[PDB]
Symmetry: C2
Subunit: 195 residues, 2 copies
């Protein structure tokens, strides 16, 4: 019973309103987990990285929306199989060690969406990306993803035009550079203290 899965950029993995059918664990790439509130608002709640489990909380129907933020590989199991499995085997202690990571990541979004100014929200969301997909580069740290202006706009609660003009401003402040949709952040620590 061994298998991986594939999803292109922007493909939702599950919709709100949908059955809570399976429970997934990321293997490569990035997933944008979001929640629809009784208001109808849909807000990013986490950008899950590798070794991240999702679709779990329901177990403990849906009001989350998981989309592939980048191309992703993930292993996935029915909810009733994780539900029986968690009872049978204790070592739940890996699931506790994972749910801490879910909290840590969701808090990292708290700091991103509480910025009120979209520039700081963007910068704060870029830095999440740097820790999670950064590689050292001659200029600085490069986020190794082909990133969409829409995708970012969606995540930070913005419009694409705003996201584009803000990246432009960052570029014209020689704070970042963009080469074939791959963002490079010259000085992460500086940028962070500035916002």
């Amino acid at each position: 019973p061994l298998q991986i899965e594939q999803f292109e950029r922007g493909k939702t993995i599950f919709f709100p309103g949908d059955p809570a059918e399976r429970v997934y664990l990321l293997v490569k790439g990035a997933v944008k987990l979001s929640r629809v509130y009784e208001s109808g608002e849909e807000i990013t709640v986490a950008l899950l990285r590798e070794n991240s489990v999702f679709g779990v909380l329901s177990l403990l129907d849906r009001f989350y929306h998981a989309v592939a933020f980048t191309p992703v590989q993930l292993f996935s199991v029915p909810i009733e199989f994780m539900q029986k499995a968690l009872i049978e085997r204790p070592e739940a202690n890996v699931m506790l060690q994972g749910l801490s990571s879910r909290i840590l990541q969701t808090e990292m979004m708290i700091e991103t969406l509480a910025h009120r100014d979209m520039g700081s929200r963007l910068v704060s969301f870029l830095l999440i990306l740097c820790r999670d997909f950064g590689i050292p580069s001659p200029d600085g740290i490069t986020i190794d993803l082909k990133l969409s202006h829409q995708a970012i706009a969606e995540a930070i609660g913005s419009t694409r035009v705003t996201v584009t003009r803000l990246l432009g401003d960052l570029r014209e402040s020689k704070l970042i550079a963009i080469h074939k949709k791959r963002i490079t952040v010259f000085n992460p620590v500086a940028l962070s203290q500035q916002f």
Copy 2:
């Protein structure tokens, strides 16, 4: 080995930088859990209600700040006693069922701090209070707490003066009323759809 504890309004239960000494569980009242980020920013991350456990994630030193938002009662245990205990006994399945609630609450703050306009942040934080400490009243739903303008300001990332002027605006829009520091929200559902 049976005992409750007491803390007045505004008393921190533990500071960031402090040892992760004990692990607590709320019994009555409300706790304002916050996180200090490497930026130095300190941001509300959750308003924990009853049956809420905290100080746990470290187990899975500190960068959270827990303060008594209202007068609280809580039972509390050293970190090494919960650490040994979680290994020995599986039924961890209550701790999983609690950590879901921590996530649910932290997300409820995501929706509050992502409002960008302080009025909606306040209203959204008041509604958290209504679900958690509301009682039916002749006028509407009353949050049963003696609430501080400072306390609210701190939670939503505002200044007290702003919080005071916003409550004034709500009052002058006959949306709420305040009698001896106890807020009454006439029409929660209406207010929610409006923000």
